[PDB]
Subunit: 323 residues, 2 copies
């Protein structure tokens, strides 16, 4: 039995764990100051809480334009022998005329073997351009049929809400080849609480299927995870092939004080078999000051199972450990 003492990582939001071929787990997440991208590594999940970080990229100076504010949800990918980090950044901390954030998507690249050796090894690839000149963030990527796919969240001015999930095939790891295809938009009760939101896409491949988990509603007690699925022998670029579950697959446990589990990612336990769900959560509701600067979204790690139909079973957020 695999069970970690949670929260594994204190004060880290949008957690992303990547188990590399060198035996290390690489941890990357949004830091509370949103001012840089850092990596930590350990051979165990528990080791991550005592793993000393290295900054791989610092935000540009305030007032200098793009990539100068709110460095959000970085993910570390190892694609065709090279390291890439997908992240969102804004030119400003201010809300626009519609009370929305102004992020665009970016990428950094590292050709060196050790992604933690030095930040001088990391180079900017610039903005990931889409069809729309609008709010975009939480990009991830996945491989299928020797093709590379980019999955992200983006605002459509013509669709109600903050963001919808899109897919596109990639020309290279920082450029789209095909036009964005909308896979999901906020529409059900569970994803439209306070704000209409679809974000934090995470990809999981198993049992001849492709699973796409995401987070819906506002970042408070209402924040929950949803899921889309497709048979892996179908065209992933045809939205009609993807099925959206009309209910959350993971949500708050009010009784156990686990508020708004979300912005999930996946990894595998030290046994190399047990599947792990990685997500952030809050332990209180009484946020004071600007909630953006309340740093207490903590990283949780817990195993998940599979049903007889070959679908993941996430269950409930694991209760916290008090030592």
């Amino acid at each position: 039995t695999v069970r970690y003492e949670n929260p594994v990582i204190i004060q880290r939001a949008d957690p992303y764990i990547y188990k590399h071929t060198d035996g290390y787990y690489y941890f990357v997440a949004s830091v509370p100051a949103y001012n840089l991208i850092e990596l930590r590594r350990a051979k165990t999940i528990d080791g991550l809480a005592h793993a000393m970080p290295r900054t791989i990229w610092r935000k540009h100076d305030s007032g200098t334009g793009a990539q100068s504010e709110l460095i959000w949800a970085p993910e570390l990918h190892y694609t065709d022998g090279k390291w890439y980090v997908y992240y969102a950044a804004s030119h400003t901390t201010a809300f626009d005329e519609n009370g929305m954030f102004q992020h665009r998507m970016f990428a950094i690249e590292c050709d060196a073997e050790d992604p933690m050796e030095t930040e001088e090894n990391w180079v900017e690839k610039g903005q990931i351009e889409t069809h729309l000149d609008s709010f975009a963030l939480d990009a991830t990527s996945f491989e299928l049929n020797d093709k590379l796919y980019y999955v992200w969240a983006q605002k459509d001015p013509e669709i109600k809400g903050n963001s919808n999930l899109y897919i596109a095939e990639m020309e290279n790891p920082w450029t789209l080849k095909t036009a964005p295809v909308m896979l999901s938009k906020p529409e059900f009760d569970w994803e439209t609480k306070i704000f209409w939101v679809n974000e934090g896409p995470a990809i999981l491949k198993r049992n001849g299927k492709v699973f796409l988990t995401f987070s819906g509603s506002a970042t408070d007690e209402n924040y929950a995870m949803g899921m889309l699925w497709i048979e892996d022998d179908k065209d992933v670029l045809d939205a009609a092939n993807w099925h959206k579950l009309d209910h959350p697959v993971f949500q708050s446990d009010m009784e156990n004080g686990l508020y708004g589990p979300g912005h999930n990612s996946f990894t595998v336990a030290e046994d190399g078999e047990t599947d792990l769900l990685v997500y952030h959560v809050r332990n209180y509701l009484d946020i004071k000051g600007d909630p953006l600067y309340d740093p207490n979204r903590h990283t949780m790690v817990q195993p998940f199972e599979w049903d007889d139909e070959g679908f993941p079973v996430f269950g409930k957020p694991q209760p916290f450990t008090f030592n």
Copy 2:
């Protein structure tokens, strides 16, 4: 043999642990953004790495004056049945004409039993005023012969360096009764590398003596700890009664990559007997960008012993654990 897997806390500088009579260890430190005072609690030292913080006080908005920037080195004290936190804060992030920070010393108070219940229980006591209108920070307090003493670091324009150590008897936990008495000024080789500094005072009482540890030199690999001591039956307000050791009592271990240990505090292990040294350290020297915003000072916790003369023996920084 008491041993913790180090670093105990990632990205926490100026670490301070207070073991309360309810069994809890309360942890308070400088957060990398220097924007608030938070507390966390656990029944074990290792447990603090997974303890969920609560914010007890937030900095004032930028541009509003005192307490609006760079919230540094908070310490939690339980004095006469009430909670107090000593911290330094500036009206600006800017260096003055002499390239120095512009901090003053402050205090917040909480009369409620639970110091973590709500920030609404915490009240500002304002600036702790001294003789000199100058740079002051790192205040601590201690009790002796039923009197309360304030120990802090402060700049004298007429003495070479950034700060000296001072003592004064307190009228109440946020106001001085006697005039400040300088106990130490930077003068030795080990405390004058790059900058002439005396800061981070910490009090330890044992074997009929009062030990005053402090940190000297610039915050790079030259950062080291020094010690003053007094026979506890002597007047603590008379500088001539204090002995200053001419050498460091704790310093960097370049070979094991433990750079610039300092800004220490003390606690006792879960056995209620073993004395623990608590300090921050760096694991690299190649800091990029502004070093003030490099967040990688990590909290270390390790036991110390005593010699046959009744002096503490701090040894060397404990090598890191990699899991």
